[PDB]
Amino acid sequence: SYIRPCYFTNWAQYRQGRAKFVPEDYTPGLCTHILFAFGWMNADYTVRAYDPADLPNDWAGEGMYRRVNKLKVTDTQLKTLLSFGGWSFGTALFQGMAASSASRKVFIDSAITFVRTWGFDGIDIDWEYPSGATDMANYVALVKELKAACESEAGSTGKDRLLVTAAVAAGPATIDAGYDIPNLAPNFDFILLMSYDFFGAWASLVGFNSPLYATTELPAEWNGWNVDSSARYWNQKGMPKEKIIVGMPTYGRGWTLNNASAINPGTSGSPAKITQYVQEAGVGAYFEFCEMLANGATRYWDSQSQVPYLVQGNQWWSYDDEESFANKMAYVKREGYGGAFVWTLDFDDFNAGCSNSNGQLYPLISVIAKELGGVIIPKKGGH
Numbered sequence: 091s092y093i094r095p096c097y098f099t100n101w102a103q104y105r106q107g108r109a110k111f112v113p114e115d116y117t118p119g120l121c122t123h124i125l126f127a128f129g130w131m132n133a134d135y136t137v138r139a140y141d142p143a144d145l146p147n148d149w150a151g152e153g154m155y156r157r158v159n160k161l162k163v164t165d166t167q168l169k170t171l172l173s174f175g176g177w178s179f180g181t182a183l184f185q186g187m188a189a190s191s192a193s194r195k196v197f198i199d200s201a202i203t204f205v206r207t208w209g210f211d212g213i214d215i216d217w218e219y220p221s222g223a224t225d226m227a228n229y230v231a232l233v234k235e236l237k238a239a240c241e242s243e244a245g246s247t248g249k250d251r252l253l254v255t256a257a258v259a260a261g262p263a264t265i266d267a268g269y270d271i272p273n274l275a276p277n278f279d280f281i282l283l284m285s286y287d288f289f290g291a292w293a294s295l296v297g298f299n300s301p302l303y304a305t306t307e308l309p310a311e312w313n314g315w316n317v318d319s320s321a322r323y324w325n326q327k328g329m330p331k332e333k334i335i336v337g338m339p340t341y342g343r344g345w346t347l348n349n350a351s352a353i354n355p356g357t358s359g360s361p362a363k364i365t366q367y368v369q370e371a372g373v374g375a376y377f378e379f380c381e382m383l384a385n386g387a388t389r390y391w392d393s394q395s396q397v398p399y400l401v402q403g404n405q406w407w408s409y410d411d412e413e414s415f416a417n418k419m420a421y422v423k424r425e426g427y428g429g430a431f432v433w434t435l436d437f438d439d440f441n442a443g444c445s446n447s448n449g450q451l452y453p454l455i456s457v458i459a460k461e462l463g464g465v466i467i468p469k470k471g472g473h
């Protein structure tokens with residue numbers, strides 16, 4: 091069966107109004123796995139909660155670990171994993187933790203104990219990114235030794251073995267500099283291919299967050315910066331297709347056009363104006379794009395890259411929608427990859443709150459649940 095993971099972020103609960111996302115916004119069958127972003131690390135490489143509100147506490151009660159893991163009562167196939175790292179975490183602490191067998195063992199033993207204590211079924215490593223010969227060998231050793239310790243703990247306790255996964259780079263230069271893929275593949279249950287953030291407001295070149303295929307609207311040098319090329323690259327380097335889980339974004343990326351009359355992919359811009367709820371210039375959520383379309387933005391379809399974009403005055407947004415998710419699910423099924431994962435639950439229209447919503451919960455993620463899982467996610471309202 092297809093693997094359909096979804097990232098939960100434990101800070102989305104702090105967004106305002108309609109954007110507040112809590113574990114109780116989940117709906118059964120939407121995902122096969124929830125990856126909890128994030129678990130955290132002490133200076134000595136032992137594991138700690140990122141947020142004090144992850145743990146049982148006086149000001150908010152059960153804690154987000156228990157509230158995510160309680161989802162398994164009403165979604166009996168669901169598994170959960172605790173993810174370590176992410177972009178904001180940087181690399182400094184990973185580089186120190188991975189430096190020796192001794193320092194790796196401190197983290198590994200602590201993380202295994204920690205996920206068993208808090209009810210998670212796996213450990214996900216999101217180091218962004220190992221780079222260079224030392225990191226490359228140390229990352230192989232970390233994943234190898236983590237899997238070995240998980241097999242030992244499973245054999246010793248008789249419990250089902252913890253999963254070992256990683257969110258991994260999609261860019262060829264980053265892949266080649268940091269990942270020895272033939273010596274990682276045997277030790278991962280699967281990898282979460284971060285096949286997004288290809289273009290974004292860190293540069294002036296306007297392009298697509300997650301194009302499925304290249305387009306000749308962008309310079310030839312970019313023709314490998316797309317979901318297809320990245321998924322094939324990991325397979326060619328030795329990762330079995332069934333372990334490649336294709337990354338699906340529910341956010342988008344946007345520019346303020348330097349020239350409001352030049353609106354084609356490949357134009358130029360600075361970062362988009364900040365959006366109300368995501369509060370990060372150049373980033374926006376699907377439930378914000380749906381309102382832009384209701385407020386006069388024009389939707390275009392890029393037939394080469396099979397993704398949409400919208401234009402509102404001098405604002406130009408690359409995003410994903412039901413149609414791009416459909417092209418991409420067809421691709422996953424046609425090419426035989428292991429499934430598709432979502433970053434994030436909280437950027438989809440998770441509560442059908444868009445002013446133009448017909449009531450469908452998770453309009454984007456429900457495409458994955460349907461097309462890879464055969465699962466129909468309900469509409470909001472009375473049943």
Ligand SMILES: *[C@@H]1O[C@H](CO)[C@@H](O)[C@H](O)[C@H]1NC(C)=O
Pocket residue numbers: 349350351352353
């Ligand atoms: C703005 O873009 C339009 C269409 O591409 C072009 O005709 C025009 O010359 C551009 N203006 C400037 C100042 O670059």
